[model samples]
Target: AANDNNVEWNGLFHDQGPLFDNAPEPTSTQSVTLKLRTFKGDITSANIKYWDTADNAFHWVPMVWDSNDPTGTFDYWKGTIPASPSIKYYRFQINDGTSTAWYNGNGPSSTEPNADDFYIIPNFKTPDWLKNGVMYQIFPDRFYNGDSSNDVQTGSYTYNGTPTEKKAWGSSVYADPGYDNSLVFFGGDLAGIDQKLGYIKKTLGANILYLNPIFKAPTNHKYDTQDYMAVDPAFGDNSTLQTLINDIHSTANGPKGYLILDGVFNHTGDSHPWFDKYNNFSSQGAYESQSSPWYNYYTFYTWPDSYASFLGFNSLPKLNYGNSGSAVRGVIYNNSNSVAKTYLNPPYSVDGWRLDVANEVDANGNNGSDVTNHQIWSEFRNAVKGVNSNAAIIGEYWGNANPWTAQGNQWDAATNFDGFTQPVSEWITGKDYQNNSASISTTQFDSWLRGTRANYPTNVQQSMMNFLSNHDITRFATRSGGDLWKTYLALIFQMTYVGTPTIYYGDEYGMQGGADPDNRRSFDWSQATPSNSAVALTQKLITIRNQYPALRTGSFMTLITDDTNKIYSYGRFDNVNRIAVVLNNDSVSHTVNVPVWQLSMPNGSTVTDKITGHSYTVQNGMVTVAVDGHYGAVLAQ
Candidate 1:
């Protein structure tokens, strides 16, 4: 009861799913589960072929067909594969029945070379420093502008061949120039950021930089990319970007900085090649004319002026990955064939991509959302992993992402929004303005943390990107009822959580902004001065995260979460180290007897409060410290 006409191919079997690497080798006797979804019942009882990393080619893995006692609706065919040494790619063929319906993980029937065009299971190990690593998200234009040479430009590339006027930097708007929230452009080019890298790395102890968008685009929020080949000239040219990459990757007496760029795969600007053809809807235009094979690629609406729509925006056109309308350019640089090869592979050699709007990348092939049918996303993943096996690709999937369960394991991991931020922000920051009464209880906090741990596997969970605020949200300080102390508590929890902690750009120095344009403001470089309270605190926390292994990749065990008393505490421990973090969320002083022996400390051992650098020691199995109301404490050994 499935429609065969709708099936699309990308050189992969419908059931092979996204390729993975470093998985435990399968046992020869154990049956492996093969999940397949297809539109036609054309493939059953087929021999399965899988690629082994050791052998570097296809080898037959064990497989069995199951066609009886089921709905027969053609969704996820489950079977077992005879185990082999780490298989990478998989394929299937109609055994002895010459119907010509053979499938492979590479996708549909294609003449494209399937060798090296697959993914290796990712290595999901989190580096130790990452546990204490505090990340800050920087929206470039809103950040400081050290140079004004490369400002906004106009009249270059548009839907039509007409000139456009350039906008001013500080002007509030073209029509009205004083409103605070109005859009404004500043010359915060890549060179500007390059000039200030030393200050950012030094002051904030930034282990990673999560830039919003730097691609060539028409809008301030470069989500709609016009050209993927060049870094927006306003944000610096390709040469400058390469230099910035090198500078960050250079050794600096400690761990090097990791860079993760945003992957905007949902749609392209209407001014793109596809839309240019849509405009000339008559005769031999590439996209609009039937003479071109790609004419049926778009989901078209003929009203008004005949434009393509994506997410209801006519200016942004959706890409059709289900058909052969646009031939896939391979992931190599013989010519600028595909985005993965031309822009990502050689000169840029980025660590990985943070997929933008990933959940919406329409599933089209027999593999559903698991194959190259994921269009550019699948191709992008393969190309990157093929070159750099250690590189990571995380999706911005804002839904349930539990890896332990049957779902959410599609990407290596996701932006840790739901897992970490939502609960802490709602509890300490009064997210919904339910200020005092809706305070987060210890029971609630522990439950959320436990759920997150249980959901994701150990590797995936620890690698989660834990963050407080980004370029999108209101400042954490503002959200926390203006109490910087409460803000500090939230950060303490973030530092101790089981993931890579990221900080919003100016949050460490307490930069304030409301929303949208306001949230995107120039970084107050003056705040990095010695006297700034936020900067001082950030430096202190970064030192602890950098020095402690338990804080980053250690197992998380909650020791206390007192509901009535408004106190929440947790401990992280590895083979030879231990760290206990306590938060006093109440307004009154609360004290609990400390048992130093239980924490594996010697009877007369002295330890330091990693956050504040204060000293404490165990005397007769007891230790005490004054945890100020609405503040935090950490005991490290």
Candidate 2:
């Protein structure tokens, strides 16, 4: 007698959950129980179909009718499954004799479901601190300049046939086609970052500081690492890094800050000692002699004249991790005293690594097999975690990162470009940095958000690094056509969204730039005052995120989305509190009637907008509020 409308799917309900004992992380030995709910006596039978790595065919397990409510409205059927080394894909089938239906990730269907649709992960664990904390990303050479003595001198070195020049603070950072901008240094260093730790902690309310590459290299960006073990002298020695770590750990205000170093493990600078033997190091490099110890670390086509490099860039030599017992692999992850482990232990004890170009690492050439990248990352995770168990491991991936994050063997999270930055940017600014400029309707925006959230595991979703703009992309303000209000609305969404928000270094103070060198401008300390509108708004949003626990770890539900009027409303709520976020993305004022019942607020309940101090009463489980043009509100009950 069960009709299509009578069945209910509740993924989060305690009695009908996939997790064992409500555990956030389940190991392989744990037993997972799944439940299905339907109108009382509506189905004659129910079964769970699942598959693991060891099984070549799908297995069906019968589920028993466990409970019938007193009101006779609904009944529950439960089934349990054992965990495995990999994820177990599952689906449900219910029959009422005459009618039959199957439920997968996308819900009821007549045909078999896709194997990649729904799954349960075993031994999946992400750091709790990172899940709840906000991160601040800093571009080292442009954040602040505190030590003048270590500043790179103009004309000291010639790069790309042009002498390196030192620019004054607050100078324009435009891209020059004739000269390489990477060689230009503005002197932002660890001493500078250390001096402003109090400001980053107290003003921004951020608990994590993610610094761009700081390894020794000829370029200011330092993506092409000359040495992995040594700190770039321009950014101060290893001792300065230790001091910054000590200060971050000892801070009294808010949560102690965590430092995440950028790990460029894919390749090394052409000038690296292992590649360059004509100058720098005293030993023979692969490019110099075939008998060198590091000879096999790189791929060569014609001995010393030609070699394989990253993206065909002759200045970067890709490290060959394909050679199983090579010294390069030992230095990266295999050896306990390797570069990856040395800084993770003792005085340096950093929080974790943010892998640069993680997806492209260990990619085999034209005729080679590319299968060991995941295993290499697994080794890196074990190495880092062996030094510090609580440390977080994040990657820089611009697209779908489900493969690296959901597997539980690779990374905790990624730089949420697909989930947050791209979609939100497209929605707010009507364009993205990649030239994909088009206005997104409310439905389209909602679909992007929902689909991206569904692709990740629960823990990965929480720990994912969400951001509006980073050093690689154009500043948010510039992308929004300098509309501060639109930027403010986007910031509100980023902070209140499911993942941990990351504030780019100068973005909180209204910095505007376009592309590469331009996006890497210096932070204007003078404009970081409380009177600045953008700075004030950013501080308020940060405070709001810190004030509400529900905002950080609550379930997100869409209350209203008006496609025609361009209004979108959502809420972050839990059993204890509810925070509603409403946005008017249009240029005209509009009133939205939000169904408060969806958030479980009772009639006559009082809800207040935390940003505007405006209050409204729930009338018959509905609350009406008028939002102005290009503005937003954060409501709490």
Candidate 3:
């Protein structure tokens, strides 16, 4: 054997060797299918022995992907998994395999050598309910305060509930510029929400209710959490909320309310006890006392005289994740303690927290630099899941949210703000799909879908929080250039797109507002009297979305994206159900062809239109869809 580092004299060493030659060849182009494939490997296999230098006991047991497997057998395992329409990479092993040892079947290379690797072509399947489940969000304060009694008494506005101004200091009143038209507290507390539950259900076609931040907070918006132990008194106390939860859960047949709450764990109100220590650390004042266990739970400036604050915002103090500092003898309330256990697992029962400012809860300095610390998110998951297994935690990530979906984090899914909102709004309102103009082409819409899906984890992609607008953004009506038809078309696309479609509270009511305070307008309960144009549109769309399961949970497929007519069409389907959505943004009318395989009816088969309830027949694998007047149509079977 040559001991020299440069043994090759003829430059043959650079040529591909037997290891490269053993690589799998490209397979033929075939339709993707999902089927059960067997994985075979022995516990004492050569790859297994090579992987475990410690000879771990786990190495002697076969590894299976099923988390619920009972017998730990390598025999046939049965379970339902997502079927992709493309090739998928998979691997099987008994241990953490090492390089140069594990089996690489007729698949791609395994990142690590000792791991068994392979690929499968999965069959395409879609969930039945996903296609029809349109979701609506309610910012409790802004929706409609139905009860006047729950309104905070003007005389009880002091920091300690003594008497102060009718409104909190530094808080915006109705006439203030920062005032949210949706933010006007109309006494629409939990009881009000409960009382009008049916009205909302009836109006929105019994869709899922995604309630914005409802935990106790000082401001009208409720994002700055003051306490989490009890429901906010303004919303009718704990009992009122409990009743609402019970009613919705037991309804038996109405819209299945998958109740979701907004989660805000990033920072606490500056009034919180954690900040009290920073104000007087030497006095052993309350949270600053030596005996207090949470003395160091807040971040403070290096200057001894400075108070604990986050980003110089005195009202919102940042939590200290490292060593506990200051005295804690008599702190009023501990935020960490409250959020870690009781808030997440309230005995009254909560479905999930919407997680405000999720990206700010890490020790990674908000830019992903530092490591090796208990992620505030990890702590949050442990607390909430410790309470309810069925609870869902959806976060407001705003931008790309891939990092949060990685294993070891507590978040179940994140809000898809950038994908559906900014782009779609710009497409429809920004000189593109405008009134009297052609709408975005189907090809452009498809590219948007594929690009978004590529950026996120497959599982996360399926459960994204698809929304048109939320409390932070402009209302859909205003964003759609204040045109009802354009807004309606945007909604149709939102419901048909993959992800959980969530509607901002007033959008269904046709409430018109713009940005911040404007978007936070008081609910126009007067408009519900049945004569409002906005109300009529909301009712019609809500009914259509509810009736079509394809809009809620079906697998999406692009059927046509006509550039000439500026029309885009797509279909959603499951084994037993199918839905097709066609949008025409042009001012003049045109007829577009619908593929036969996507239709529910056979040749000459006729299906009813959801928008008009009119039936149309299919011919030669194509259906002529009349596109006119910037309208979107939903045809389902």
Candidate 4:
């Protein structure tokens, strides 16, 4: 007889039944029972072929066939495997002496098992709140200015040969030509963020706020850090940050908010006390004297006039993480009183850190290769987790982040540009920052989305910092040529996609700008009215996400993608409920027939569009929904 098709692949279950009862995280002490089910009396024996990381070879383990199973008309086979820190790759082989088949992630395989092998990650877990939470990214110098008194005055200091100036709140940010954009500050501060926490948490539905570097620095965008321990005076002091943290945790409505500060450990301003290229600070810096204690912290080719700076920027000097007992590393993460631990421990108690340019951190760029980047991050993770186990560590990686997010020892997640934002932006706007007028086909978009999801572990995928536009790029609306529908479609994709969604400040208010300082527009309070189409749509999407557990922690499955019609449909589903999202990127309306069976929805089930309040019923295992031109629909059952 032909192989029975009544097989079931249960992700949360083992041969002994459901797993994760004793502990949520996979541990070395735990034993996982692999299980597979086939039609009763169809298979005689089953075995699991697994790759043993220690032996670096394939091994087979026999699975006992339980013919006495009573759950359904199926025979269950089970086998236990010892857990290890390395990823466990395995596939099941079923046979009745004459016929054999292999089962893996993509289901029954006729050929040898390859990329589709199932994986078990040991000790992999992310913060519970973070996995389901929404984040709001704030560029402090541009977000809001609650305290005009803290504004940086003109000519307060010179940076990059240009004197710093405080721009008017509503003035054009790129008024000045050349590299002087960094010198422009609009007086936005921690006090401003603190005052607007209510709007962020209540109106915007954001439970986490990720602020760009607020440390003392020579420029408005403080990535070039001058002092790691002190807050920039223009952005208020450490006390103001502490008060913001307090307000976030003590908010009455919704869950306690999390504040993630940006940590720029890879480099520091040339004028920093440690580097002191201008002898601005009291400490003897590397540029001042070769005998200085901080001299070894940097790489100088000609007595500080020439040093290894980040991306060839002379104003920013790179830190030497490879130096033995380096003070730079010591202050960043090594010592108990280090910058990372001090703020994470007490009155400050920020939720976590978002490492700036994290991929480049610890790389000994001046001379030799520093392969210890991962090791450095691992130790940093331990130190942060040692202080606050619930705190998250996310990296600002614009490309493939698997190298930093894998091994369960580095970052919890990353700013998901490559995985989610870049591709989605390309699909929606027809181009990204680097590729103008570049239109990605539906197949290409789907391929990128699937490829990225496959690269990272499940937990990392869930905690990825998903955003469509940020401080570094053109605003989402501007990228879409001020098309509200296109922006809405991207926001819909972000909210329903697997990962934590982050709304750049003013994105919901329909703010539009192009590139660097232009992208850092002040939050337009006037445009935040309820009548604003973008704001209304964003609030609606956030509400949908907040109301449905399926949208938050549910499994993602693509139901349909029709390149011919430029329509794509997918679903977020848990065991209890399911939400199907349909989008039409074309300029004309299209009726998308989504395969509901792919989402495990019963035939003849009723599904209502959460956005439009329109109802749709499943017929012949499919649901038909009309999506307007450049629009999307979120249907729920």
Q: Which regions in candidate 2 have their CA more than 4 angstroms from the true location?
A: 1-21, 33-49, 54-86, 91-116, 175-179, 363-369
> Residue 206 lDDT in model 4?
86
TM-score of each: 0.71, 0.90, 0.70, 0.90
What is the number of backbone collisions in each predicted candidate, taken in the order shown? 25, 0, 54, 0
lDDT of each: 0.57, 0.78, 0.52, 0.78
In candidate 4, what residue range of length 10 has the lowest lDDT sum? 11-20
Candidate 2 structure quality by residue, lDDT tens digits, 482-505: 888887788778888888899998
Superposed on all Cα atoms, the candidates' RMSDs to the truth, in angstroms, are 15.1, 3.6, 12.6, 3.9
Candidate 3 residue lDDT tens string, 1-637: 1222221211111000111111111223332222121222212221211122123222222323322112121222122222323434432222222222222331222244433223232321112233235566777765665677778654344442233222332234354343332234545577767777776666655456778767676666676566655677888776777777766555553666656666565566644444443342333422355454444655444532354544555556555444222122112112334543443344456566677766765331242213422244555555566566556667777776655653324465688876677667656665321122323445665666655654543335556778777777777677566677766677667756767777777676566666576676656666663466555655676676566554544445566777778787777665455667788766677787777344333666665667666777777656777866567777777
Scored by Cα lDDT, where does model 4 land? 0.78
How far does residue 53 in candidate 1 sit from its true spot (Å)? 21
Where is model 3 poorest over a 10-residue stretch in terms of lDDT? 10-19
Superposed model 3: Cα runs more than 4 Å off: 1-133, 153-184, 277-293, 303-312, 323-346, 364-379, 406-409, 431-442, 529-549, 598-601
- Give a tens-digit lDDT track for model 1, residues 365-415: 122244443444545555665666556667775545642111222455678
Task: Give the TM-score (vs. native) of candidate 1.
Answer: 0.71
